[PDB]
Coordinates of C-alpha atoms (C1' of nucleotides) in Angstrom, one line a residue:
Chain A
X1 CA 46.3 -93.0 -104.1
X2 CA 48.7 -90.1 -103.9
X3 CA 47.6 -87.8 -101.1
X4 CA 50.6 -85.7 -100.1
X5 CA 53.0 -84.9 -103.0
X6 CA 55.2 -82.8 -100.7
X7 CA 55.5 -85.7 -98.2
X8 CA 56.2 -88.1 -101.1
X9 CA 59.0 -85.9 -102.4
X10 CA 60.5 -85.6 -98.9
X11 CA 60.4 -89.4 -98.6
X12 CA 62.2 -89.8 -102.0
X13 CA 65.0 -87.7 -100.7
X14 CA 65.0 -89.4 -97.3
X15 CA 65.1 -92.9 -98.9
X16 CA 67.7 -91.9 -101.5
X17 CA 69.8 -90.2 -98.9
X18 CA 69.7 -93.2 -96.6
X19 CA 71.4 -95.3 -99.2
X20 CA 73.7 -92.5 -100.3
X21 CA 72.5 -92.1 -103.8
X22 CA 74.0 -89.4 -105.9
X23 CA 70.8 -88.2 -107.6
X24 CA 67.1 -88.7 -107.5
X25 CA 64.3 -87.7 -109.9
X26 CA 61.1 -86.3 -108.5
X27 CA 58.0 -85.5 -110.6
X28 CA 57.8 -81.7 -110.6
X29 CA 55.3 -79.2 -109.3
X30 CA 55.6 -75.5 -108.6
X31 CA 55.5 -76.0 -104.8
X32 CA 57.9 -79.0 -104.8
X33 CA 60.2 -77.0 -107.0
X34 CA 60.3 -74.1 -104.6
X35 CA 61.1 -76.5 -101.7
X36 CA 63.9 -78.0 -103.8
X37 CA 65.3 -74.5 -104.5
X38 CA 65.5 -73.7 -100.7
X39 CA 67.4 -76.9 -100.1
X40 CA 70.0 -75.8 -102.6
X41 CA 70.2 -72.2 -101.3
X42 CA 70.6 -73.6 -97.8
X43 CA 73.2 -76.1 -98.8
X44 CA 71.4 -79.4 -98.2
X45 CA 71.5 -80.6 -101.8
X46 CA 74.2 -80.1 -104.4
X47 CA 72.1 -79.0 -107.5
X48 CA 68.6 -79.2 -108.8
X49 CA 67.6 -79.5 -112.5
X50 CA 64.1 -79.0 -113.9
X51 CA 63.5 -81.2 -117.0
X52 CA 60.4 -80.4 -119.1
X53 CA 58.3 -83.0 -120.9
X54 CA 54.7 -83.5 -122.1
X55 CA 53.7 -84.4 -118.5
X56 CA 54.3 -82.3 -115.4
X57 CA 58.1 -82.3 -115.5
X58 CA 60.8 -83.9 -113.4
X59 CA 63.1 -82.5 -110.7
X60 CA 66.5 -84.1 -110.7
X61 CA 68.1 -83.5 -107.3
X62 CA 71.8 -84.1 -106.6
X63 CA 72.4 -85.1 -103.0
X64 CA 75.4 -83.7 -101.1
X65 CA 77.8 -85.7 -99.0
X66 CA 80.8 -84.4 -97.1
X67 CA 84.2 -85.9 -96.6
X68 CA 84.0 -89.5 -95.3
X69 CA 80.8 -89.9 -97.3
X70 CA 78.9 -88.2 -94.5
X71 CA 75.3 -87.4 -95.2
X72 CA 74.5 -83.6 -95.0
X73 CA 70.8 -84.2 -94.6
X74 CA 70.3 -86.1 -91.4
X75 CA 66.5 -86.1 -91.3
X76 CA 63.3 -84.8 -93.0
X77 CA 59.9 -84.6 -91.4
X78 CA 56.6 -83.6 -93.0
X79 CA 54.8 -81.3 -90.5
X80 CA 51.6 -80.1 -92.2
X81 CA 49.7 -83.1 -93.6
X82 CA 46.5 -83.5 -95.6
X83 CA 44.9 -84.9 -92.5
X84 CA 46.0 -82.2 -90.1
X85 CA 47.2 -78.8 -91.3
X86 CA 49.7 -76.8 -89.2
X87 CA 49.7 -73.0 -89.4
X88 CA 52.1 -70.9 -87.3
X89 CA 52.0 -67.3 -86.1
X90 CA 54.9 -65.0 -86.9
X91 CA 56.3 -65.3 -83.4
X92 CA 55.6 -69.1 -83.1
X93 CA 57.6 -70.0 -86.3
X94 CA 59.7 -73.0 -85.0
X95 CA 63.4 -73.2 -84.9
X96 CA 64.7 -76.7 -85.9
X97 CA 67.4 -78.5 -84.0
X98 CA 68.1 -75.3 -81.9
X99 CA 68.8 -73.3 -85.1
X100 CA 71.1 -75.9 -86.7
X101 CA 68.3 -76.9 -89.1
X102 CA 65.6 -75.1 -91.0
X103 CA 61.8 -75.1 -91.3
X104 CA 60.0 -74.4 -94.6
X105 CA 56.9 -72.2 -94.1
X106 CA 54.5 -71.4 -96.9
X107 CA 53.5 -67.7 -96.5
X108 CA 51.8 -65.1 -98.6
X109 CA 55.2 -63.6 -99.2
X110 CA 56.2 -67.0 -100.7
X111 CA 57.8 -70.3 -99.7
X112 CA 60.5 -69.2 -97.2
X113 CA 62.7 -70.8 -94.6
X114 CA 62.0 -70.2 -90.9
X115 CA 64.7 -67.6 -90.5
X116 CA 63.6 -65.7 -93.6
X117 CA 59.9 -65.7 -92.6
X118 CA 60.8 -64.6 -89.1
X119 CA 62.7 -61.6 -90.4
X120 CA 59.5 -60.5 -92.3
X121 CA 57.3 -61.1 -89.2
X122 CA 55.3 -63.5 -91.4
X123 CA 53.6 -66.7 -90.5
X124 CA 51.9 -69.4 -92.5
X125 CA 51.7 -73.2 -93.1
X126 CA 54.7 -75.1 -91.7
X127 CA 55.5 -77.5 -94.5
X128 CA 58.5 -79.4 -93.3
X129 CA 61.5 -79.6 -91.0
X130 CA 65.0 -80.3 -92.5
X131 CA 68.1 -80.9 -90.4
Chain B
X1 CA 64.4 -132.6 -121.7
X2 CA 62.8 -130.2 -124.3
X3 CA 59.2 -129.8 -125.1
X4 CA 58.2 -131.8 -128.1
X5 CA 55.6 -129.3 -129.2
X6 CA 57.6 -126.1 -129.1
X7 CA 60.4 -127.9 -131.0
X8 CA 58.2 -129.2 -133.8
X9 CA 56.2 -126.0 -134.0
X10 CA 53.0 -127.7 -132.9
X11 CA 50.4 -125.0 -132.0
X12 CA 47.3 -127.1 -131.7
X13 CA 47.3 -130.5 -129.9
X14 CA 44.3 -132.6 -130.9
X15 CA 42.6 -135.5 -129.1
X16 CA 42.1 -137.2 -132.4
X17 CA 45.8 -137.6 -133.1
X18 CA 46.0 -140.9 -131.2
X19 CA 49.4 -141.9 -132.4
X20 CA 50.9 -138.6 -131.1
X21 CA 48.9 -138.8 -127.8
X22 CA 50.1 -142.3 -127.1
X23 CA 53.6 -141.1 -126.6
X24 CA 52.5 -139.4 -123.3
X25 CA 50.7 -142.3 -121.5
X26 CA 52.3 -145.0 -119.6
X27 CA 52.1 -148.8 -120.1
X28 CA 49.2 -148.9 -117.6
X29 CA 47.6 -145.8 -119.2
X30 CA 48.6 -143.2 -116.6
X31 CA 49.2 -139.8 -118.0
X32 CA 53.0 -139.3 -117.7
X33 CA 54.0 -136.3 -115.5
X34 CA 55.5 -133.2 -117.0
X35 CA 58.7 -133.7 -114.9
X36 CA 59.3 -137.0 -116.7
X37 CA 58.3 -135.9 -120.3
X38 CA 59.9 -132.5 -120.3
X39 CA 56.8 -130.8 -121.7
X40 CA 56.2 -127.1 -121.3
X41 CA 53.6 -126.1 -118.7
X42 CA 51.3 -124.6 -121.2
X43 CA 51.3 -127.7 -123.5
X44 CA 50.9 -130.2 -120.6
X45 CA 47.5 -128.7 -119.8
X46 CA 46.4 -128.8 -123.5
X47 CA 47.7 -132.3 -123.8
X48 CA 45.9 -133.4 -120.6
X49 CA 42.6 -132.2 -122.1
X50 CA 43.3 -134.1 -125.3
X51 CA 44.0 -137.4 -123.4
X52 CA 40.8 -137.0 -121.4
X53 CA 38.8 -136.4 -124.5
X54 CA 40.5 -139.4 -126.2
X55 CA 39.8 -141.7 -123.2
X56 CA 36.2 -140.5 -123.3
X57 CA 35.9 -141.4 -127.0
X58 CA 37.7 -144.8 -126.6
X59 CA 40.8 -143.8 -128.5
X60 CA 42.9 -144.3 -125.4
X61 CA 42.3 -146.7 -122.4
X62 CA 41.6 -145.6 -118.9
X63 CA 43.2 -148.7 -117.5
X64 CA 45.4 -151.1 -119.6
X65 CA 45.4 -154.8 -118.8
Chain C
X23 CA 30.6 -120.9 -134.7
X24 CA 32.8 -123.8 -135.6
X25 CA 32.2 -127.1 -133.9
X26 CA 33.6 -130.6 -134.5
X27 CA 31.1 -133.3 -134.0
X28 CA 32.5 -136.8 -133.7
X29 CA 30.3 -139.8 -133.1
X30 CA 30.5 -143.6 -133.2
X31 CA 28.0 -145.8 -134.9
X32 CA 27.7 -149.4 -133.6
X33 CA 29.7 -151.8 -135.7
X34 CA 26.9 -154.3 -136.3
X35 CA 25.3 -152.6 -139.3
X36 CA 25.5 -152.8 -143.1
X37 CA 26.7 -150.0 -145.3
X38 CA 23.1 -149.2 -146.3
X39 CA 22.1 -148.5 -142.7
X40 CA 25.3 -146.5 -142.1
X41 CA 24.7 -144.1 -145.0
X42 CA 21.1 -143.7 -143.7
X43 CA 22.4 -142.7 -140.3
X44 CA 24.9 -140.2 -141.7
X45 CA 22.3 -138.6 -143.9
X46 CA 19.8 -138.4 -141.1
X47 CA 22.1 -136.7 -138.6
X48 CA 23.8 -134.4 -141.1
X49 CA 20.3 -133.3 -142.1
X50 CA 19.5 -132.5 -138.5
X51 CA 22.6 -130.1 -138.3
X52 CA 21.8 -128.4 -141.6
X53 CA 18.1 -128.3 -140.7
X54 CA 18.9 -126.1 -137.7
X55 CA 20.8 -123.5 -139.7
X56 CA 24.3 -125.1 -139.6
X57 CA 26.7 -125.5 -142.5
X58 CA 28.9 -128.7 -142.7
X59 CA 32.4 -127.5 -143.6
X60 CA 34.2 -130.9 -143.3
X61 CA 33.1 -134.5 -143.0
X62 CA 35.9 -137.0 -142.4
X63 CA 35.2 -140.7 -141.9
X64 CA 37.9 -142.7 -140.1
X65 CA 35.9 -145.9 -140.7
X66 CA 35.9 -148.9 -138.5
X67 CA 38.5 -148.6 -135.7
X68 CA 39.2 -150.8 -132.8
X69 CA 37.7 -149.2 -129.6
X70 CA 40.1 -148.9 -126.7
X71 CA 37.6 -150.5 -124.5
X72 CA 34.2 -152.2 -124.8
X73 CA 31.1 -150.0 -125.1
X74 CA 27.8 -151.8 -124.6
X75 CA 29.7 -155.0 -125.4
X76 CA 31.1 -153.6 -128.6
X77 CA 34.9 -153.7 -129.3
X78 CA 34.7 -151.8 -132.7
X79 CA 32.8 -149.0 -134.3
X80 CA 32.6 -146.6 -137.2
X81 CA 34.2 -143.2 -136.4
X82 CA 32.6 -140.2 -138.1
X83 CA 34.0 -136.7 -137.9
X84 CA 31.6 -133.9 -138.9
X85 CA 32.9 -130.3 -138.7
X86 CA 30.1 -127.7 -138.8
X87 CA 29.5 -124.0 -138.2
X88 CA 26.3 -123.3 -136.3
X89 CA 24.8 -121.6 -133.2
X90 CA 24.2 -123.3 -129.9
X91 CA 20.6 -124.3 -130.8
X92 CA 21.8 -126.4 -133.7
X93 CA 24.5 -128.4 -131.9
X94 CA 22.4 -128.9 -128.8
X95 CA 19.7 -130.6 -130.9
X96 CA 22.2 -133.0 -132.3
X97 CA 23.2 -133.9 -128.7
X98 CA 19.7 -134.7 -127.7
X99 CA 19.0 -136.9 -130.7
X100 CA 22.4 -138.5 -130.7
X101 CA 21.8 -139.7 -127.1
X102 CA 18.4 -141.1 -127.8
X103 CA 19.4 -143.1 -130.9
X104 CA 20.6 -146.6 -130.2
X105 CA 22.8 -146.7 -133.3
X106 CA 25.1 -143.8 -132.2
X107 CA 26.9 -145.2 -129.2
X108 CA 28.9 -142.1 -128.3
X109 CA 29.4 -138.5 -129.5
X110 CA 31.1 -135.2 -128.6
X111 CA 30.5 -131.7 -129.7
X112 CA 33.7 -129.6 -129.6
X113 CA 34.2 -125.9 -130.4
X114 CA 37.1 -125.5 -132.8
Chain D
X24 CA 27.2 -108.0 -125.1
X25 CA 28.0 -108.8 -128.7
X26 CA 30.3 -106.7 -130.8
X27 CA 27.8 -105.4 -133.3
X28 CA 25.4 -104.3 -130.5
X29 CA 28.4 -102.5 -128.9
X30 CA 29.2 -100.6 -132.1
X31 CA 25.5 -99.5 -132.3
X32 CA 25.6 -98.2 -128.7
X33 CA 28.9 -96.3 -129.1
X34 CA 28.0 -94.7 -132.4
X35 CA 24.6 -93.7 -131.1
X36 CA 25.8 -92.1 -127.9
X37 CA 29.3 -90.7 -128.9
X38 CA 29.8 -87.0 -128.5
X39 CA 31.9 -86.8 -131.7
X40 CA 33.2 -89.0 -134.5
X41 CA 36.2 -90.4 -132.6
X42 CA 34.8 -90.2 -129.1
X43 CA 34.8 -93.5 -127.1
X44 CA 35.8 -92.3 -123.6
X45 CA 33.0 -89.8 -122.9
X46 CA 30.8 -90.5 -119.9
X47 CA 27.8 -90.8 -122.2
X48 CA 29.5 -93.6 -124.2
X49 CA 30.7 -95.5 -121.1
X50 CA 27.3 -95.3 -119.4
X51 CA 25.6 -96.7 -122.5
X52 CA 27.9 -99.7 -122.6
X53 CA 27.4 -100.3 -118.9
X54 CA 23.7 -99.9 -119.0
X55 CA 23.4 -102.6 -121.6
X56 CA 25.8 -104.9 -119.7
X57 CA 23.7 -104.2 -116.6
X58 CA 20.4 -105.0 -118.3
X59 CA 21.9 -108.0 -120.1
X60 CA 23.4 -109.4 -116.9
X61 CA 20.2 -108.9 -115.0
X62 CA 18.4 -111.2 -117.5
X63 CA 21.0 -113.9 -117.0
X64 CA 20.6 -113.7 -113.2
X65 CA 16.8 -114.0 -113.5
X66 CA 17.4 -117.7 -114.5
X67 CA 20.7 -118.4 -112.7
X68 CA 19.6 -116.8 -109.4
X69 CA 22.3 -118.6 -107.4
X70 CA 25.3 -117.3 -109.5
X71 CA 26.6 -115.1 -106.7
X72 CA 30.1 -114.7 -108.3
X73 CA 28.7 -113.3 -111.5
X74 CA 26.4 -111.1 -109.5
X75 CA 29.4 -109.4 -107.8
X76 CA 30.4 -108.4 -111.3
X77 CA 27.1 -106.6 -111.7
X78 CA 27.6 -104.7 -108.4
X79 CA 30.9 -103.3 -109.6
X80 CA 29.2 -102.3 -112.9
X81 CA 26.4 -100.6 -111.0
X82 CA 28.9 -98.7 -108.9
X83 CA 30.8 -97.7 -112.0
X84 CA 27.7 -96.4 -113.7
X85 CA 26.6 -94.4 -110.7
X86 CA 30.1 -92.8 -110.6
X87 CA 30.0 -91.9 -114.2
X88 CA 26.4 -90.5 -113.8
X89 CA 27.5 -88.5 -110.7
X90 CA 30.5 -87.2 -112.6
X91 CA 28.4 -86.1 -115.6
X92 CA 25.8 -84.4 -113.4
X93 CA 28.4 -82.4 -111.6
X94 CA 30.4 -81.5 -114.7
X95 CA 27.4 -80.3 -116.8
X96 CA 23.9 -80.8 -115.6
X97 CA 22.4 -80.4 -119.0
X98 CA 24.2 -83.2 -120.7
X99 CA 23.4 -85.4 -117.7
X100 CA 19.6 -84.9 -118.0
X101 CA 19.5 -85.6 -121.8
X102 CA 21.3 -89.0 -121.3
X103 CA 19.0 -90.4 -118.6
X104 CA 16.0 -89.7 -120.8
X105 CA 17.4 -91.5 -123.8
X106 CA 18.4 -94.5 -121.6
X107 CA 15.3 -94.4 -119.4
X108 CA 17.0 -94.2 -116.0
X109 CA 15.4 -93.0 -112.8
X110 CA 18.5 -91.1 -111.5
Chain E
rG17 C1' 36.2 -70.5 -114.5
rA18 C1' 39.6 -72.3 -118.4
rA19 C1' 43.4 -76.0 -119.8
rC20 C1' 46.8 -80.8 -119.2
rU21 C1' 47.5 -86.4 -118.9
rU22 C1' 50.6 -89.5 -115.6
rG23 C1' 45.8 -91.5 -111.6
rA24 C1' 41.1 -93.7 -113.0
rG25 C1' 38.3 -95.4 -116.8
rU26 C1' 36.6 -96.5 -122.4
rG27 C1' 37.9 -98.1 -127.3
rC28 C1' 40.9 -101.3 -130.3
rA29 C1' 44.4 -106.2 -130.6
rG30 C1' 45.9 -110.4 -128.0
rA31 C1' 46.6 -114.3 -123.5
rA32 C1' 45.9 -117.9 -119.5
rG33 C1' 42.8 -119.9 -115.9
rA34 C1' 39.7 -126.4 -110.8
rG35 C1' 36.0 -118.3 -111.3
rG36 C1' 30.6 -119.0 -111.1
rA37 C1' 25.4 -121.0 -112.6
rG38 C1' 22.6 -124.5 -115.6
rA39 C1' 22.1 -129.0 -118.6
rG40 C1' 24.2 -133.5 -120.1
rU41 C1' 27.9 -137.6 -120.6
rG42 C1' 32.0 -140.9 -119.1
rG43 C1' 35.7 -144.6 -116.5
rA44 C1' 37.6 -146.7 -112.0
rA45 C1' 36.2 -148.5 -107.1
rU46 C1' 32.8 -149.8 -102.6
rU47 C1' 28.0 -151.9 -101.5
rC48 C1' 23.6 -154.7 -103.0
rC49 C1' 20.8 -158.3 -106.4
rA50 C1' 20.8 -162.6 -110.0
rC51 C1' 23.5 -166.6 -112.1
rG52 C1' 28.0 -170.2 -113.3
rU53 C1' 32.5 -172.5 -111.1
rG54 C1' 33.8 -173.9 -106.3
rU55 C1' 34.5 -175.5 -100.2
rA56 C1' 35.2 -174.6 -95.1
rG57 C1' 36.3 -171.0 -93.1
rC58 C1' 36.0 -165.4 -93.7
rG59 C1' 36.7 -161.0 -91.0
rG60 C1' 39.2 -158.6 -87.3
rU61 C1' 43.4 -157.6 -83.2
rG62 C1' 48.9 -156.0 -79.5
rA63 C1' 46.2 -160.7 -78.4
rA64 C1' 41.2 -162.0 -78.9
rA65 C1' 36.2 -162.0 -79.1
rU66 C1' 31.4 -160.0 -80.9
rG67 C1' 30.0 -160.6 -86.2
rC68 C1' 29.3 -163.3 -91.1
rG69 C1' 29.5 -168.8 -93.1
rU70 C1' 27.4 -175.8 -94.9
rA71 C1' 20.7 -172.3 -95.2
rG72 C1' 27.1 -172.7 -99.3
rA73 C1' 30.1 -167.7 -97.0
rG74 C1' 35.0 -165.4 -98.2
rA75 C1' 37.6 -166.2 -103.3
rU76 C1' 36.3 -166.3 -108.7
rG77 C1' 33.4 -165.0 -113.9
rU78 C1' 29.4 -162.5 -116.5
rG79 C1' 25.4 -159.0 -116.4
rG80 C1' 22.4 -155.5 -113.7
rA81 C1' 20.8 -151.7 -109.8
rG82 C1' 21.9 -147.4 -107.1
rG83 C1' 24.5 -143.4 -104.5
rA84 C1' 28.9 -140.5 -103.6
rA85 C1' 33.6 -138.8 -105.3
rC86 C1' 36.5 -137.6 -109.7
rA87 C1' 43.1 -141.8 -109.7
rC88 C1' 47.3 -140.5 -113.4
rC89 C1' 47.8 -135.4 -115.0
rA90 C1' 49.0 -132.5 -110.2
rG91 C1' 53.2 -128.5 -109.9
rU92 C1' 55.4 -123.3 -102.3
rG93 C1' 50.8 -124.6 -110.3
rG94 C1' 46.2 -121.6 -111.8
rC95 C1' 41.6 -118.9 -110.8
rG96 C1' 38.5 -116.2 -107.1
rA97 C1' 37.1 -110.4 -102.7
rA98 C1' 36.9 -114.1 -99.0
rG99 C1' 34.6 -118.9 -98.0
rG100 C1' 36.3 -121.8 -101.9
rC101 C1' 37.0 -124.1 -106.8
rG102 C1' 40.1 -130.5 -109.6
rA103 C1' 36.4 -136.3 -114.7
rC104 C1' 34.7 -134.6 -120.0
rU105 C1' 31.2 -131.9 -123.2
rC106 C1' 27.9 -127.8 -124.3
rU107 C1' 24.7 -123.0 -122.6
rC108 C1' 24.9 -118.4 -119.8
rU109 C1' 28.3 -115.3 -117.2
rG110 C1' 32.1 -112.3 -113.8
rG111 C1' 37.0 -110.7 -113.1
rU112 C1' 42.3 -110.2 -113.9
rC113 C1' 46.8 -109.7 -117.1
rU114 C1' 49.7 -107.8 -121.7
rG115 C1' 50.3 -104.3 -125.8
rU116 C1' 48.3 -100.0 -128.1
rA117 C1' 48.4 -94.9 -127.6
rA118 C1' 42.3 -94.0 -130.8
rC119 C1' 39.0 -91.5 -126.9
rU120 C1' 37.0 -88.9 -121.7
rG121 C1' 40.1 -85.6 -118.8
rA122 C1' 40.9 -86.3 -111.8
rC123 C1' 35.7 -88.9 -113.2
rG124 C1' 40.0 -91.1 -107.8
rC125 C1' 41.1 -93.6 -102.4
rU126 C1' 39.0 -95.1 -98.0
rG127 C1' 34.4 -96.1 -96.1
rA128 C1' 31.0 -95.8 -89.7
rG129 C1' 25.8 -97.1 -90.3
rG130 C1' 23.6 -100.2 -94.4
rA131 C1' 23.3 -104.3 -98.2
rG132 C1' 25.2 -108.8 -100.3
rC133 C1' 28.4 -113.1 -99.9
rG134 C1' 30.3 -116.4 -96.2
rA135 C1' 33.9 -123.8 -94.8
rA136 C1' 31.8 -127.4 -91.4
rA137 C1' 28.2 -128.5 -88.0
rG138 C1' 23.0 -127.4 -87.1
rC139 C1' 17.6 -126.3 -88.4
rG140 C1' 12.5 -126.5 -91.6
rU141 C1' 9.8 -128.9 -95.9
rG142 C1' 10.4 -132.8 -99.5
rG143 C1' 13.5 -136.1 -102.0
rG144 C1' 17.7 -139.5 -102.0
rG145 C1' 20.9 -142.9 -99.3
rA146 C1' 26.4 -146.9 -101.9
rG147 C1' 30.5 -145.6 -98.7
rC148 C1' 31.4 -143.1 -94.3
rG149 C1' 29.5 -142.3 -89.6
rA150 C1' 27.8 -138.3 -83.9
rA151 C1' 24.1 -141.0 -80.9
rC152 C1' 23.3 -146.2 -79.6
rA153 C1' 24.1 -151.7 -79.2
rG154 C1' 27.4 -155.6 -78.6
rG155 C1' 33.0 -157.8 -78.1
rA156 C1' 37.4 -156.5 -76.0
rU157 C1' 41.0 -153.5 -73.0
rU158 C1' 41.0 -151.6 -67.8
rA159 C1' 41.3 -150.9 -60.8
rG160 C1' 37.1 -148.4 -63.5
rA161 C1' 36.7 -147.3 -69.5
rU162 C1' 30.1 -143.6 -70.0
rA163 C1' 37.2 -143.7 -74.3
rC164 C1' 41.2 -145.1 -77.4
rC165 C1' 40.8 -150.7 -80.4
rC166 C1' 37.0 -154.3 -82.9
rU167 C1' 31.9 -155.8 -85.3
rG168 C1' 27.3 -153.3 -86.4
rG169 C1' 24.9 -148.7 -86.8
rU170 C1' 20.8 -143.7 -86.5
rA171 C1' 21.0 -138.5 -87.6
rG172 C1' 24.1 -136.4 -91.0
rU173 C1' 27.2 -136.5 -95.2
rC174 C1' 24.1 -135.9 -101.1
rC175 C1' 19.7 -132.8 -103.8
rA176 C1' 15.8 -128.5 -104.2
rC177 C1' 14.1 -124.2 -101.6
rG178 C1' 14.6 -121.5 -97.2
rC179 C1' 17.0 -120.4 -92.5
rC180 C1' 21.3 -120.1 -89.6
rG181 C1' 26.0 -116.2 -90.1
rU182 C1' 29.9 -118.9 -86.8
rA183 C1' 35.8 -121.1 -87.5
rA184 C1' 43.3 -121.5 -85.7
rA185 C1' 37.1 -117.7 -91.5
rC186 C1' 45.2 -117.6 -90.5
rG187 C1' 49.8 -114.7 -93.9
rA188 C1' 47.3 -115.1 -86.3
rU189 C1' 49.8 -109.4 -91.0
rG190 C1' 43.0 -103.8 -93.2
rA191 C1' 42.5 -101.1 -97.9
rG192 C1' 45.1 -97.4 -101.4
rU193 C1' 49.4 -95.1 -103.2
rG194 C1' 54.6 -93.9 -104.0
rC195 C1' 60.0 -94.7 -102.7
rU196 C1' 64.2 -97.9 -101.1
rA197 C1' 70.7 -103.3 -103.3
rA198 C1' 70.9 -107.9 -105.4
rG199 C1' 70.8 -113.5 -106.6
rU200 C1' 67.6 -117.3 -107.9
rG201 C1' 63.3 -120.6 -109.4
rU202 C1' 58.2 -120.6 -111.5
rU203 C1' 53.1 -118.9 -114.1
rA204 C1' 50.6 -115.8 -118.2
rG205 C1' 52.0 -112.1 -121.8
rG206 C1' 55.0 -108.3 -124.9
rG207 C1' 59.5 -106.6 -127.4
rG208 C1' 64.6 -107.9 -129.4
rG209 C1' 68.8 -110.5 -130.5
rU210 C1' 72.0 -114.9 -134.7
rU211 C1' 67.8 -117.7 -137.3
rU212 C1' 62.6 -121.6 -141.4
rC213 C1' 62.8 -123.0 -136.7
rC214 C1' 64.1 -125.4 -132.3
rG215 C1' 66.0 -123.3 -128.9
rC216 C1' 69.8 -120.3 -126.1
rC217 C1' 70.8 -115.2 -124.6
rC218 C1' 68.8 -110.0 -123.5
rC219 C1' 64.8 -106.8 -121.9
rU220 C1' 60.1 -105.9 -120.1
rU221 C1' 55.0 -106.1 -117.4
rA222 C1' 51.8 -108.6 -113.9
rG223 C1' 51.5 -112.7 -110.2
rU224 C1' 53.7 -116.7 -107.2
rG225 C1' 58.1 -119.0 -104.0
rC226 C1' 63.4 -119.0 -101.6
rU227 C1' 67.8 -116.6 -100.2
rG228 C1' 69.6 -111.9 -98.8
rC229 C1' 71.8 -105.8 -98.3
rA230 C1' 70.1 -101.1 -96.2
rG231 C1' 66.4 -100.4 -92.6
rC232 C1' 63.1 -102.3 -88.9
rU233 C1' 62.2 -105.7 -84.5
rA234 C1' 62.3 -107.4 -77.3
rA235 C1' 63.9 -111.4 -79.8
rC236 C1' 62.3 -114.7 -83.4
rG237 C1' 62.3 -112.8 -87.8
rC238 C1' 60.5 -109.1 -92.2
rA239 C1' 63.1 -107.6 -96.1
rU240 C1' 60.3 -104.6 -103.9
rU241 C1' 54.6 -110.0 -102.1
rA242 C1' 58.1 -105.4 -95.8
rA243 C1' 56.9 -106.5 -90.3
rG244 C1' 61.6 -100.7 -94.1
rC245 C1' 60.6 -95.1 -95.4
rA246 C1' 56.3 -92.1 -96.0
rC247 C1' 50.9 -89.9 -96.8
rU248 C1' 45.1 -90.9 -96.8
rC249 C1' 40.9 -93.6 -94.8
rC250 C1' 38.7 -97.5 -91.8
rG251 C1' 38.7 -101.3 -87.6
rC252 C1' 40.6 -102.4 -83.0
rC253 C1' 43.8 -102.7 -78.1
rU254 C1' 44.8 -100.4 -72.7
rG255 C1' 47.0 -106.3 -66.6
rG256 C1' 44.9 -111.6 -65.6
rG257 C1' 40.3 -113.8 -63.9
rG258 C1' 34.9 -112.6 -63.4
rA259 C1' 33.4 -113.1 -69.2
rG260 C1' 32.3 -113.2 -74.3
rU261 C1' 29.1 -114.0 -68.8

RNA sequence: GAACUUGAGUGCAGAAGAGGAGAGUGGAAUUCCACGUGUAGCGGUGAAAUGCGUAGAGAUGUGGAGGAACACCAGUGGCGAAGGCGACUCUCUGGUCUGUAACUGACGCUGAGGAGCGAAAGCGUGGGGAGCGAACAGGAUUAGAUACCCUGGUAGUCCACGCCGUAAACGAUGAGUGCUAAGUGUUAGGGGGUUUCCGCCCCUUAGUGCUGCAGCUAACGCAUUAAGCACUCCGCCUGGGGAGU
């Protein structure tokens, strides 16, 4: 059965990205929606729509490709998993691809990027890497 | 070829209907294969049961001679 | 439930004996809480092959509605009798 | 399990007029199937394939009983009395 | 703690199936027994012989006995968790699939240890025994032939109960879930499109095959039935022998 919705959402993006799809639709949740919003703010995806319905909602994500159809998102990794959680100290918050990518940490301040969390001297669960 | 039963709207094949059944057995009494008679898969199975019931009740022969 | 009992009476009997047989076995079915919906009689047909050295027989076709118990009792008696040479119970 | 027996069970155990999904209802249906199937296996001891069906039923019943007990202990206790279960 | 319905399950309406257990019934064929007709070989091999036959064989006709297996249908067809399941009828009985949104509202996944099942051979008790046939005997072959080949043939194969618990038990591929081009057969459904229909065409589920992108692989190949991309749980591997000792 479904065990890691966050991982599953990342995989939908990875798979859709791999075949240069324009858009994908992810079943929504509060945490998945926050991750999607970071990707837009950080310029990894084009746009994100939240469609309501009777069920839990759908996130339509529009992927972003440069000139020459180049994929902006090169890779996505799930770090914290249901089987092995990963929490980081404020000073041990990882940089991703030597600062060319981002890491998404869930903190008590909110769901931030690595840079944002570092400025607040906050740690927390390291959700994913994106580069 | 087309299935005789779907064409004529035959829902229930019956082992009693010997005259109909006899169109599906060979000269020797062998049940003709579906590939040769064009019957639908579903109706071939129903038809096979009918012939076996008929052969049991002496309406059709097992071996013609 | 609806069953269709067909059976074959040996062809070497007179009409008096035949009617006796039919009444006897129809009574068995009804006796065990059945109800005879239909009763066709195909009459003497040529058997496809010899049964007990008989090339012909009288084909009866009794439709009934009954439980297991009723149809099973026909089977037992139909086998024992020497007049009925073959039978088949069939759910409809 | 005949249809009229099933209607008896569901009406007797349902938590409300339209209720057919409640743990109570499901456990009642299963309990009869389990008892009914046990009787069949007493004569046809060697019907291993059918028996496997019983084992899934037994597991389903235990899971529904476990769910009920954890959701609301009261409701759980009432049901096992009416059904005569040892759980 | 309170809600929600997608997961899971229940209800309701349909569908297919060698799924299982029990009890019956049927036709072909082999063997044996009796009888009629009938005479000198039959059988077997690469070639022969052993063997059977004038005591009447083999061939042929009628009837009967008994045991085992179910031609045609039959199909990378169906069903089952796997082993496996194929004549017909009835009794009992498990599971799966499709639609529905009437109901419960996360009740789910995996699962060490444990329990149950598990081809064939084999074992115990008692039946049964046609065909087949380890062992064994004889005839050949051969340098030898404790084999291949031939003629016989015991256990066994079959049944009831119990035991055994192993297979190249294989897709050499653990279970669950989701995501990621297409084309093309085929099985069981649903909906629709011109219709009495037939049918053709379109769509949709769930299986079962082939081809084939992306991706993966040492290569061969896999490829919506993944060996791709992911997450959960379990099992297992760490050079070859020694040794599955």
